[PDB]
């Protein structure tokens, strides 16, 4: 017959990812301190 | 009658014993890595109420695995004697069972049974996590077919 071994497709496989994809998220340093002191002022008031 | 009373009490005790088998996994070689596949997210070891426990003072089953050399031999017996009653040792793998493929070696004791009274012999090289889990289930049923109170009652 003809060779039917495990072969990659003639079009090649799909993309592969090799990155440190840690996502930037959250707030800015000024914002956290500001909102933190705002709650404290609310708590005191 | 009294026979039924002790039988129910015997059932209750072994139900605990065949449930909280906190193990001393004392593996040393490639039998040790495949055992973690039985502590796996794939096959949970904690799901059968048993958690890998340090401090051999609180331990019930000692999982011995990997090849057993003469140098390790004094250290293996001392920890076994430190292990409290009840204590069962499950020989995992060809090396720990009879010596395995490291049989005729000058520095291998042929099988752990020559040093410790093995209760369950799990064959494999490595014994697949399913196979060794099956041995644990086999040991669990062994606790079920126990007659401690019956022997004391009928002494």
């Amino acid at each position: 017959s003809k060779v039917k071994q495990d072969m990659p497709p003639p079009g090649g496989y799909g993309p592969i990812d090799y990155k440190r994809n840690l996502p930037r998220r959250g707030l800015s340093g000024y914002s956290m301190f500001a909102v933190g002191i705002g709650t404290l002022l609310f708590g005191y008031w | 009658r009294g026979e039924y009373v002790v039988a129910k009490l015997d059932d209750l005790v072994n139900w605990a014993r065949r449930s909280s088998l906190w193990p001393m996994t004392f593996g040393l070689a490639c039998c040790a890595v495949e055992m973690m596949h039985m502590a796996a997210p794939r096959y949970d070891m904690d799901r059968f109420g048993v958690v890998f426990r340090a401090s051999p003072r609180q331990s019930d089953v000692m999982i011995v695995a990997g090849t057993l050399t003469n140098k390790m031999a004094p250290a293996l017996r001392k920890v076994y004697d430190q292990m409290p009653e009840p204590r069962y040792v499950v020989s995992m793998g060809s090396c720990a069972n009879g010596g395995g493929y490291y049989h005729y070696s000058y520095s291998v004791v042929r099988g752990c049974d020559r040093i410790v009274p093995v209760d369950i012999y799990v064959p494999g090289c490595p014994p697949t996590a399913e196979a060794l889990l099956y041995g644990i289930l086999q040991l669990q049923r062994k606790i079920k077919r126990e007659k401690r109170l019956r022997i004391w009652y009928r002494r």
Binding site: - | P117, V118, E146, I151, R155
Partner: protein, 342 residues
């Protein structure tokens, strides 16, 4: 002897020596050591077991794979023993209850079974028999221990003409229940000494020699109805034992003379417990039953083994009893007590 029984091998664990031992009730003091000596040079042990297999677990690492076979048996049914000794070059007996039990009294474990195994083993065509009976075996003795052994002595005598009955005296060793006994009188307040123990000398022998005697008696031709007697090399007085142990135990000692009238209550009260009767009436009376020095019966040297002195083997058993305070103190700290040996 059979071709398969031909002894070849350099006395090793997997070596073949031809002794098809069938040690009865090995889950005990000398059952532990006898199989070890039997398993040392290689000899199939067929040991009947009736208790839970766990307490028999520690006998497994005593021989080659396929040597120590565990077989179920019953004391009452004769067919049980029939199966365990259907193929046995020799048979060795040691079964005997050291206290009182509801289902077994003294004789039931000292006349029924030892003679029952005796007749069936001859019925099974065995070639040896090494049944044991305490060396102070006397019907006339007040102790029902010795009375039971003596009637057991004659029962196996008539049933088996070649019954090489074993007469061991007091035996000390790792779990001797005697050296551990006087160690445990600490937990009963002041140590009670009947008549202070001024008039009791006993012969204790280290068990490895006792076990060595049985196997040597197995391999030596002689036997066939002999009455070998097993004693130690020296005997201490009853005080003299207790002062020695408490010295090597370094435990505080209060030798308060306790009359035997209260030993009746003490032996009874420790017996009422639905668990192991630590002390029984026969034990409270066997303490003064001083071991004799009978020379007529053959001793250890007749077999060819010498009895290790008690003071040579003391820490091995008793290092556990002494606390951490003197855990590292060896023989030389404790001198041997007064030797009143014959």
């Amino acid at each position: 002897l059979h071709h398969a029984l031909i002894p070849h091998g350099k006395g090793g664990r997997s070596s073949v020596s031809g002794i098809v031992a069938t040690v009865f009730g090995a889950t005990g003091f000398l059952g532990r050591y006898v199989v070890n000596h039997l398993g040392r040079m290689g000899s199939q042990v067929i040991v009947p077991y009736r208790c839970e297999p766990y307490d028999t677990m520690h006998l497994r690492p005593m021989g080659d794979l396929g040597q120590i076979i565990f077989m179920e048996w019953n004391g009452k049914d004769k067919d049980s023993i029939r199966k365990v000794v259907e193929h046995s070059n020799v048979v060795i007996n040691l079964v005997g209850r050291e206290w009182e039990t509801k289902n077994f009294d003294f004789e039931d474990v000292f006349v029924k079974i030892p003679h029952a195994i005796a007749q069936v083993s001859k019925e099974a065509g065995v070639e040896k028999l090494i049944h044991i009976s305490h060396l102070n075996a006397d019907i006339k003795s007040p102790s029902r221990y010795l009375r039971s052994k003596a009637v057991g002595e004659k029962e196996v005598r008539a049933a088996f003409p070649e019954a090489t009955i074993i007469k061991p005296s007091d035996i000390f060793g790792r779990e001797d229940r005697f050296l551990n006994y006087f160690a445990s009188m600490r937990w009963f307040g002041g140590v009670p000494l009947i008549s202070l123990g001024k008039e009791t000398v006993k012969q204790p022998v280290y068990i490895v020699d006792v076990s060595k005697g049985i196997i040597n008696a197995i391999k030596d031709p002689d036997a066939k109805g002999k009455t070998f007697a097993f004693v130690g090399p020296n005997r201490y007085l009853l005080f003299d034992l207790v002062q020695y142990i408490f010295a090597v135990a370094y435990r505080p000692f209060l030798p308060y003379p306790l009359p035997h009238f209260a030993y009746r209550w003490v032996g009874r009260l420790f017996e009422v417990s639905p668990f192991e009767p630590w002390t029984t009436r026969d034990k409270v009376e066997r303490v003064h039953m001083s071991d004799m020095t009978l020379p007529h019966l053959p001793g250890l040297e007749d077999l060819g083994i010498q009895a290790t002195p008690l003071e040579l083997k003391a820490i091995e058993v008793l290092r556990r009893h002494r606390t951490y305070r003197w855990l590292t103190s060896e023989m030389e700290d404790v001198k041997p007590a007064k030797t009143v040996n014959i």
